[PDB]
Design a protein around this ligand. Structure first.
Ligand SMILES: [Ca+2]
Ligand SMILES: [Mn+2]
Length: 707
């Protein structure tokens, strides 16, 4: 390691001078840089004795001594330089090099310091075989109330590993300590240690170190609880951001009978963001509304991501930890209590899971990091250094889904969420992202990748191996791949937002509903008028409504009612986005796309008429579930050419039950002759072959059966 930081003495000593030599590698910020550079530095986890960013005192100046080479001497001693107390262990220096303007810089790097004065003398790392075998070796193992075994995987894509790992925590006041050095198992490629005499909430992180990488603080990627700096007030002062791991060595949640999702093959799914679902923005808030969701008639709740995400105000598509759920919504047991209450109310729970990308906080990112480019190292075995799909870069931390380490981690995580939280299915976020192919657009990305199809099958098969009746849904939008994968039994998001927005607004152009019903495999496509990612139908009305649909609330709800009568009446699974049932009309853009949205439960009263239409239509799918069987005959007229004389829907079951829907989406009344037979206005007995006047924006729903 001549590239980057060089140390003389080669083992830095707390109470001696240290000369630091920076060599700029080729194709880095400072390669061929003509002027002197400056040191931004401090000791320990919290950068003790750091200057104000940009302080250009001669003291901080790295003199250019050769081409691409700068040196600084911390004179007197490294302790005197940082003004650290003689009895305070000086164990790490954190180092950033920057230009005089503090614009161009290197990123978080630390080296080890030997402090013999304070009894921290370096000991050779020890080789020991893992005292355990089987699957799921890595992570946290409670032996007893006073004892934990930690197992941290360490092998980069080149086959190398770190020189040593310490475990710091509340048991050792967050110091590096020889007694707390982990042992390396070369065969399993794991660091391990058994902590004993713990005295109950154990807090810890790891300090990993090599000569080529320097030092890095990171938590356990398999921790079930975490404190995050900048969110948790009780984040320990001696720990480094972002994460400490929490292990209680605990009052285990007592689950209430066996649960099975209602209408398993064609469920109505309510998409829910806990942050914006209630004013409390949490599980406690959501719990209060389960009787509302039960009566609405839904089969499942789909929670937008609940795994630990950056900060505490997010959609959650920014996961830092996959085995720890975000404490901003509630405790592990509040999550269990919520899912258990859902089940008691006959409602299944689906987790939105985000395996395309993680963030800089993830132990997998922190473990093999590029301190020059501020992204994963080319030697990272889970993550790409650079996103291969350059159209969609949601973070610097894109998962390599051809990695055997990434694949095993995903499958273990899926199994964990099923076993621990008793959930009934998954919605895979951005599965189009599960690709190593170098692309820069939508077309080259959308083009079939056999390895993406292959890994998505692996993840599906893994879920079904844990829970045979678990629902798997993917947000994919790779047309040819969806045809192939739907045959395996994977469910796909079927986005009908554009059509039902056009219809809601009273525009016939691009209003064709037909995409909602896949003729080949209707049950494999989860159709929606709204998702968290789309603008609201009821907002489009205010903004670009045709005539009265702009400003007449009565006519707007009639039109949304008719949309709903050409949605819930259709075979195959369906999804609604929270508050669509009460005509939620705040633009997705209000307070920014992903910003906190107004909570408007008063809409359940003001728009009661629409809530009642949603309720009866969804409930009909349970009361007469045999109608909605994929075996049933389904025909409809919902094209550009089906407008002026209205749109029609006929559903005909094997047992002879029939549903007929007529909708006038136009701004004028249309004359319609009811089909021949004996019918019933199921939502309120009617003779067929009878001419009716159907008012502007209204629907008529007829069943050949009473209740
Ligand atoms: Ca968080
Ligand atoms: Mn990706």
């Amino acid at each position: 390691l001549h590239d980057g930081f060089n140390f003389d003495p080669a083992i830095p000593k707390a109470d001696e001078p240290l000369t630091i030599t920076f060599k700029a590698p080729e194709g880095s910020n400072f390669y061929g840089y003509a002027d002197d550079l400056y040191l931004h530095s401090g000791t320990g986890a919290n950068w003790t004795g750091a200057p104000t960013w940009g302080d250009n005192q001669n003291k901080y100046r790295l003199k250019k001594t050769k081409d691409n080479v700068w040196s600084i001497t911390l004179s007197s001693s490294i302790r005197h330089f940082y003004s650290v107390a003689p009895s305070t262990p000086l164990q790490t220096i954190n180092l950033i090099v920057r230009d005089a303007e503090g614009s161009q810089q290197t990123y978080d790097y630390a080296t080890l310091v030997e402090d013999s004065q304070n009894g921290f003398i370096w000991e050779e790392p020890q080789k020991a075989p893992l005292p355990i075998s089987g699957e799921e070796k890595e992570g946290i193992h409670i032996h007893s109330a006073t004892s934990i075994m930690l197992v941290l995987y360490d092998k980069d894509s080149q086959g190398g590993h770190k020189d040593c790992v310490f475990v710091t925590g509340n048991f050792n006041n967050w110091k590096l300590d020889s007694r707390y050095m982990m042992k390396y198992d070369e065969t399993n490629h794991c660091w391990w240690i058994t902590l004993e005499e713990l005295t109950g909430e154990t807090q810890f992180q790891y300090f990993v170190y090599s000569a080529s990488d320097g030092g890095t603080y990171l938590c356990d990627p398999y921790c079930e609880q975490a404190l995050e700096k900048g969110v948790d007030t009780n984040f320990p002062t001696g720990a480094q951001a972002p994460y400490v791991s929490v292990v209680s060595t605990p009052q285990p949640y007592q689950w209430s009978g066996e649960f099975e999702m209602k209408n398993k093959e064609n469920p109505v799914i309510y998409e829910l963001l806990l942050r914006d679902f209630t004013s409390s923005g949490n599980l406690a808030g959501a719990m209060e509304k389960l009787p509302y969701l039960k009566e609405l008639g839904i089969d499942a709740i789909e929670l937008m991501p609940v795994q630990e995400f950056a900060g505490n105000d997010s959609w959650g598509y920014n996961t830092g930890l996959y085995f720890a759920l975000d404490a901003s919504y509630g405790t592990q047991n509040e999550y269990k209590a919520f899912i258990d209450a859902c089940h008691q109310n006959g409602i299944a729970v689906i987790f939105d899971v985000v395996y395309n990308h993680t963030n800089n906080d993830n132990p997998f990112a922190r473990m093999y990091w590029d301190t020059f480019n501020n992204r994963p190292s080319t030697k990272n075995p889970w993550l790409n250094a650079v996103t291969p799909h350059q159209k969609y870069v949601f973070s610097p931390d894109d998962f390599n889904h051809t990695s055997e380490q990434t694949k095993a981690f995903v499958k273990r995580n899926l199994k964990y969420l099923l076993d621990t939280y008793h959930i009934d299915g998954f919605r895979f976020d951005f599965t189009k992202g599960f690709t190593q192919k170098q692309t820069t657009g939508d077309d080259d990305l959308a083009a079939t990748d056999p390895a993406r199809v292959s890994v998505l099958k692996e993840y599906y098969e893994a879920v079904k191996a844990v829970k045979e009746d678990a629902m798997v849904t993917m947000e994919h939008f790779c047309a040819n791949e969806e045809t192939t994968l739907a045959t395996e039994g994977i469910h796909f998001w079927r986005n009908m937002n554009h059509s039902y927005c056009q219809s809601a607004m009273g525009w016939k152009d691009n209003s064709d509903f037909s995409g909602l019903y896949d003729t080949t495999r209707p049950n494999q496509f989860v159709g929606y008028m709204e998702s968290h990612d789309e603008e609201r139908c009821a907002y489009k009305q205010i903004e670009y409504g045709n005539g009265a649909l702009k400003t007449n609330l009565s006519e707007r709800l009639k039109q949304l009612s008719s949309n709903a009568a050409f949605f819930f009446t259709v075979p195959g699974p369906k999804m609604l986005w929270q508050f669509g049932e009460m005509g939620y009309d705040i633009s997705i853009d209000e307070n920014g796309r992903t910003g906190k949205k107004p909570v408007l439960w008063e809409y359940q009263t003001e728009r009661k008429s629409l809530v009642d239409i949603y309720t009866k239509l969804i409930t009909l799918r349970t009361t007469h579930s045999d109608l909605f069987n994929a075996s049933s005959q389904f025909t409809w007229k919902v094209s550009y050419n089906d407008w002026d004389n209205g749109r029609t829907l006929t559903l005909k079951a094997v047992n002879g039950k029939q549903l007929h829907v007529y909708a006038n989406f136009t701004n004028a009344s249309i004359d319609y002759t009811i089909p021949e037979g004996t019918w019933y206005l199921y939502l309120e007995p009617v003779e067929g072959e009878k001419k009716i006047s159907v008012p502007a924006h209204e629907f008529r729903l007829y069943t050949n059966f009473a209740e």
